[PDB]
Design a protein around this nucleic acid. Structure first.
Ligand SMILES: [Zn+2]
Lengths: 194, 104, 154, 134, 52, 131, 342
RNA sequence: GAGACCGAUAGCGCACAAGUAGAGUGAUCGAAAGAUGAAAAGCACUUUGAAAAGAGGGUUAAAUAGCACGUGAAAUUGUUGAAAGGGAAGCGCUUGUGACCAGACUUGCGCCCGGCGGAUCAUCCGGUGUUCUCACCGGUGCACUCCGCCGGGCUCAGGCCAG
RNA sequence: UGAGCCCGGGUCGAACGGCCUCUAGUGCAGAUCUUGGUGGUAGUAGCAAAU
RNA sequence: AAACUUUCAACAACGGAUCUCUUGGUUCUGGCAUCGAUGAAGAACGCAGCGAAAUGCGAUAAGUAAUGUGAAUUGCAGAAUUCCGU
């Protein structure tokens, strides 16, 4: 009933579908090789299917689904671990997906190479971020920002800056922190200070 | 959706699963389409039981004036229908390819 | 980017507000425009002369031809009147502003009106509608320009 | 969910009743839970409070403040506890408003009626506990 | 109030659509299609013992 | 080499918006285009020196359609799940974080997209750099 | 109408409004009559006015400030500790480099990676004497240098201060203050602040330029050990001996954890007849300066700084021990308005 | 007791003083009008001054939340700033000047050396789950193989615009 | 192309959106349209009832 | 050049639109049968410490008796009013 389920999933509804205004529909299923909802790659309409996924542990696996085990959702996927050698991993995909459709072969190869390139780039950016020591932190929340704005306005109003600057300047002049014959002030007015 | 038999399984699972959020309970003799296809979408997850299955048989034969419909298509696999030995033998030679080259 | 001109120091400034005043908005606007940007003593004497019928406030925007006398030469405007209640409430408000500046500890000698804004108020729902006004005025001590010390070469 | 036709799930009626309940219903609403030692000493979860209960605070900006209940303002659904006060502009101390649901009882002002209430609630509890057990 | 609220649907169509819904429930991908998170159960009908 | 794919040059037939007639003179008329229905209106009659009308002729090329000037198509993203959806197709699409996304989820989208080679149009919304 | 809410008692908008307006007019009338009578009695007797002035003073957050009851975490007044002992060593131990004489300062100024606030940062270098601004990248696709590296580079080339002006919204937002120290002393404290209200002198009305002379610093109202740490860091940033011939003042005034930066210049002039004599705080009318004022013309940018983080080495990446972070500003710390960390 | 209802110009005329206020001789006609804040904690006190008014100062997470109070559009108005104006304005195509704002490819893979560490490496040992032949762990090592990390070395590829 | 959609900056404080369907009290420049608010006339006419 | 007029930006006025909320309204459904000469529906006048409005009450007048619950009223004044208690 592959055609029937494809019709139901494409013409009526799909819980894994994310249709965009940019002319392409995306498939949210975690086992879809391509990120587009289409007949060639639908994990639900294609009973016999293959996928490439990366484990958290850095290990890459290829998953197989067949119509004899179309049921048993706990057992749908066969997991075969790929080698860290790119060429040998592609070869192993070749044998283990021999007699499979050319489209699925092509997209499995593409997803393998894309995951390994993403791993390379993640390690590079991790090294780069380490060597720079910079981290992206969130900005101040709007309520906190309002708080410091209001308290700053009140603090300045109570601070009365230039009055205090003159305060300390005259205090130092009176205490004679500018020394004898100050170059700050006129000798006239100085005698007034005396 | 939990399906049971009131004649053999009884009516205690009704309350037992009534309390649990999300899960519903429906008798085998009064199957509800609103629960079978929520929101018009097909594929409701139903936890069945053996008595429920043996009574689906009985009720679906017992419904008077209704028979299990005969479908207009026997082999649902259109891939089977097209990519079969008899069809591929009876077909004529192709007149082109999927992607045609530009002539001029 | 660009930075807007920063506000004058609050402790070099004085503010005064009068809300829901029962004087015609047009007359208050004209009087405020006449007294805008002036010396404090000059503005007070001007408004006292306006009350004493001596000097006339020229109408520019909200101008209705009422008086054509020789008092309009000093402004170059041919339409001049004498807003009495406007002059009196504005005198009160600059006196309040002067008291506020004295409390803040500013030099009384050099207050100048940088800003005076007159807006309309909610209409007095009594068809005859009154037009109250809001008047806010901001004053400062005269800006001070000071000496340089001669730059030392090194 | 609700089965008895007498009970209603209408939020409108529920809010109307909550905001227009008489004083006894207000007391029942402003029942409060008892502390641990009290719960293992009386086999009761919560009883309505009175003016002579030593109480501890578990929620709010004044958390972990202990004192005796000063009053129970039923009209505003609030209770006044000793030493939890704020100063107004003039400096006069008004007692800060806190909720029975946000406080927990530490000591009970025990009289005949209170002992009867705890006895009734407890007795029901072990009755149903035994009914479930055996 | 006399607007048409209730809709008359043929019993034959209702029974037909209930049978179709049961077949859809028997179909495994349609559970994902409807959104049910079905990944650990060992059988898509999942008949359980009446004894338990 | 981290950019969009080779693409046909983006040609915009018209860059200025289509303005509603008399929306300049009446403020109650929004600038959104409304096709006039008057039998003698000059704009509808298409006289010279009048506002032009929208047309499928003004319609743009399909190969360059919906493409940003950098050459990517905007993908509205809400989380790292959306970023992992963009995983296979970053040379086609660029992430656009939803406006209602919180600060840490924005940070996670930015970090995952940077690890994943996905360009983000708004990577400076509610975040700052810390040393 | 001070303890009861008309909005929650009277259910009608118009009735509540009319009652409120009548009551407030009555209250204003009564208050003015009472104050006029009290004015008359204080005019006939001048002594009860003095009792009023000694009995009623306006409430003040500064004298409502709450202290703790020296480890860089407790906000306790150092001077109070000092004369309580009479009736900080911890700071010296933690930062021996900061607290004998410091060398003549030399400052290297830079901004965030691919910054666009070059003119503002050059202005900051103009405030800080003996400072040079150098850009970080020199083009979009250059090598990205890390603040640890720039600190090391400047130390090996002989600088003593490294100032980093990070940006946001194409405006200066944060100032990271690194200290390079001398000889074999490792790079030290990093006081990160938040440059908020930044304003250039060009935009400042009535302003002027700063001159090449060394200005003197006025570090006002720093009392807690953290405030003393910040003040001493700025003192290290500025030269020790100001060229008093060039009459320039750089003032950092601290009130309620909001450090205010201003730069003015002197004119010591006689008091004009309409002016006042500068009155003392609690001790009004200072004795000795009886006819002389000070003229100030701001010749520097307006910024407000607020300290957020001080670290042990050159940032979090560079602070390695079990006391990597020495202090971090927190909204839980700033919840209460009377709690000032300075 | 409920709703695939309406949500303060809607829903009964009335969410609030509603058949109230008010009009008419009379039968009758009949409105407008909700929201501070979690809690009044509803602005103490000083200082202007005749007021439904200000300046300080205080409460609150916030008072440009102050009983004119959840948010606060447009019409209309004022101040500041820029530009323009010889008997209409406004609009279209196309530059130019000024002002402000934004910021281009997100800028890397590959090979070759020397060291280091991990692993479908070992016909290595042990355990677990399983689609019973595939996985995942615990334990040894580095002879071979594969990965990385470091320090060298070489190459290539790239976005736009001009000639 | 378009009706419209997304994001950046400010404000703001409690709920909201994308898709598949279902439903309707669903899209405004006119109606000397209804209600409310606000202008020029105009600080003009005139001090007239009301206020 | 100023004034005046026009466009735009920032800010400030007016105004109550948009989002949110609802002790309201509308419709449907279910249970029951109950006004009055033993004075009905309705109108008026009074009753509180401060009562304007609304509600309650009727010279025993924001009400009395009896029963039940079990420690309040509350905007302010107040009790020597009441707490193992008719
Ligand atoms: Zn799909």
């Amino acid at each position: 009933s592959d055609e029937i389920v494809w019709q139901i999933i494409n013409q009526q509804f799909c819980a894994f579908k994310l249709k965009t205004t940019k002319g392409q529909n995306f498939c949210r299923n975690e086992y879809s090789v391509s990120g587009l909802c289409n007949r060639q790659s639908c994990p639900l309409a294609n009973s016999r299917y293959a996928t490439v996924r990366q484990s958290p542990k850095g290990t890459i696996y290829l998953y197989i689904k067949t119509i004899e085990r179309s049921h048993m959702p706990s057992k749908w996927w066969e997991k075969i671990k790929l080698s860290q050698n790119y060429q040998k991993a592609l070869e192993q995909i070749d044998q283990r997906l021999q007699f499979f459709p050319k489209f699925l072969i092509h997209k499995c190869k593409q997803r393998l190479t894309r995951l390994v390139q993403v791993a390379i780039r993640m390690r590079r950016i991790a090294a780069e971020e380490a060597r720079l020591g910079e981290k992206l932190v969130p900005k101040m929340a709007p309520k906190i920002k309002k708080r410091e704005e209001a308290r700053e306005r009140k603090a300045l109003a109570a601070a009365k800056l230039e009055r205090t600057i003159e305060r300390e300047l005259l205090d130092r002049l009176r205490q004679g922190a500018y020394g004898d014959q100050p170059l700050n002030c006129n000798p006239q007015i100085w005698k007034k200070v005396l | 959706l939990i399906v049971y038999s009131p004649e053999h399984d009884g009516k205690e699972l009704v309350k037992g699963f009534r309390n649990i959020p999300g899960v519903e309970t429906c008798p085998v003799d009064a199957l509800n389409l609103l629960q079978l296809a929520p929101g018009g979408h097909l594929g409701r997850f139903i936890v069945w039981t053996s008595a429920a299955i043996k009574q689906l048989d009985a009720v679906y034969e017992s419904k008077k004036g209704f028979f299990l419909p005969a479908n207009i298509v026997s082999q649902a696999d259109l891939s089977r229908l097209i990519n079969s030995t008899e069809i591929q033998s009876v077909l004529r030679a192709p007149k082109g390819e999927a992607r045609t080259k530009r002539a001029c | 980017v660009r930075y807007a001109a920063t506000e004058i120091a609050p402790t070099k400034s004085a503010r005064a507000r009068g809300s829901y005043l029962r004087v015609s908005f047009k007359n208050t606007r004209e009087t405020a425009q006449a007294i805008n940007g002036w010396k404090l003593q000059r503005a007070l004497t001007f408004l006292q002369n306006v009350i004493d019928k001596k000097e006339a406030v020229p109408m520019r925007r909200y101008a209705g031809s009422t008086g054509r006398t020789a008092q309009g030469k000093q402004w170059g405007v041919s339409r001049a009147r004498w807003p009495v209640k406007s002059a009196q409430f504005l005198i009160g408000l600059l006196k309040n502003a002067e008291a506020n500046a004295d409390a803040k500890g500013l030099d009384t000698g050099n207050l100048i009106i940088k800003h005076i804004q007159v807006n309309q108020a909610p209409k007095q729902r009594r068809p005859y509608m009154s037009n109250p006004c809001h008047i806010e005025l901001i004053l400062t001590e005269a800006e001070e320009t000071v000496q340089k010390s001669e730059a030392v070469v090194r | 969910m609700k089965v008895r036709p007498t009970v209603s799930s209408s939020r409108r009626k529920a809010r109307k009743a909550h905001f227009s309940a008489p004083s006894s219903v207000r007391r029942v609403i402003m029942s409060a839970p008892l502390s641990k030692e009290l719960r293992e000493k009386y086999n009761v979860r919560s009883i309505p409070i009175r003016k002579g209960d030593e109480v501890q605070i578990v929620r709010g900006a004044h958390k972990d403040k202990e004192g005796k209940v000063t009053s129970v303002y039923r009209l505003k659904y609030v209770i006044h506890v000793e030493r939890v006060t704020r100063e107004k502009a003039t400096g006069q101390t008004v007692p800060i408003g806190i909720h029975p649901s946000n406080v927990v009882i530490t000591k009970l002002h025990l009289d005949k009626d209170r002992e009867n209430i705890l006895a009734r609630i407890k007795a029901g509890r072990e009755q149903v506990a035994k009914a479930k057990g055996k | 109030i006399w607007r048409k609220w209730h809709v008359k649907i043929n019993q034959g169509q209702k029974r037909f659509a209930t049978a179709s819904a049961l077949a859809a429930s028997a179909v495994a991908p349609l559970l994902m299609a409807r959104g049910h998170q079905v990944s650990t159960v060992p059988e898509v009908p999942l008949v359980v013992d009446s004894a338990a | 080499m981290v950019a969009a794919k080779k693409h046909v040059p983006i040609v915009k037939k018209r860059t200025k918006r289509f303005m509603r007639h008399q929306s300049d003179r009446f403020k109650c008329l929004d600038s959104a285009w409304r096709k006039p229905k008057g039998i003698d209106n000059r704009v509808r009659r298409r006289f010279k020196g009048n506002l032009a009308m929208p047309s499928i002729g003004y319609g743009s090329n399909k190969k360059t359609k919906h493409m940003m000037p950098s050459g990517h198509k905007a993908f509205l993203v809400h989380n790292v799940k959306d970023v992992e959806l963009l995983l296979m197709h970053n040379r086609t699409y660029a992430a656009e974080i939803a406006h209602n996304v919180s600060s840490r989820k924005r940070i996670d989208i930015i970090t995952r997209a940077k690890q994943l080679g996905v360009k983000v149009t708004n990577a400076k919304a509610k975040v700052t750099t810390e040393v | 109408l001070s303890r009861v809410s008309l909005a929650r008692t009277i259910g009608n908008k118009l009735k509540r409004q009319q009652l409120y307006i009548q009551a407030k007019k009555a209250n204003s009338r009564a208050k003015h009559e009472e104050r006029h009578r009290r004015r008359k009695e204080e005019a006939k007797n001048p002594e009860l006015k003095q009792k009023r002035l000694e009995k009623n003073q306006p409430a003040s957050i500064d004298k409502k400030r709450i202290w703790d009851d020296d480890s860089l975490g407790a906000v306790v007044d150092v001077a109070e500790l000092k004369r309580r002992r009479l009736e900080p060593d911890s700071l010296t131990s933690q930062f021996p480099n900061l607290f004998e004489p410091p060398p003549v300062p030399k400052i290297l100024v830079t901004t965030g990676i691919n910054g666009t606030i070059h003119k503002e940062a050059e202005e900051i270098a103009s405030i800080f004497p003996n400072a040079t601004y150098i850009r970080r990248t020199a083009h979009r696709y250059a090598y990205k240098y890390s603040v640890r590296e720039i600190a090391k580079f400047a130390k090996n080339r002989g600088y003593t201060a490294l100032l980093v002006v990070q940006e946001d919204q194409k405006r200066p937002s944060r100032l990271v203050v690194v200290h390079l120290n001398g000889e074999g002393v490792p790079p030290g404290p990093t006081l990160t602040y938040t440059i908020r209200n930044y304003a250039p002198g060009k935009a400042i009305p009535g302003h002027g330029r700063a001159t090449n002379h060394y200005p003197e610093l006025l570090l006002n109202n720093f009392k807690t050990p953290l405030g003393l740490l910040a003040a001493k860091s700025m003192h290290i940033l500025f030269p020790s001996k100001p060229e008093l011939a060039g009459r320039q003042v750089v003032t950092l005034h601290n009130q309620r954890d909001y450090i205010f930066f201003r730069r003015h210049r002197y004119v010591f002039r006689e008091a004009r007849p309409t002016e006042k004599n500068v009155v003392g705080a609690d001790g009004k009318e200072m004795e000795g300066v009886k006819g002389i004022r000070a003229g100030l013309q701001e010749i520097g940018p307006r910024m407000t700084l607020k300290l957020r983080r001080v670290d042990k080495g050159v940032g979090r990446a560079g602070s390695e021990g079990p006391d990597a972070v020495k202090w971090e500003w927190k909204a839980k710390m700033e919840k209460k308005r009377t709690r000032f960390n300075l």
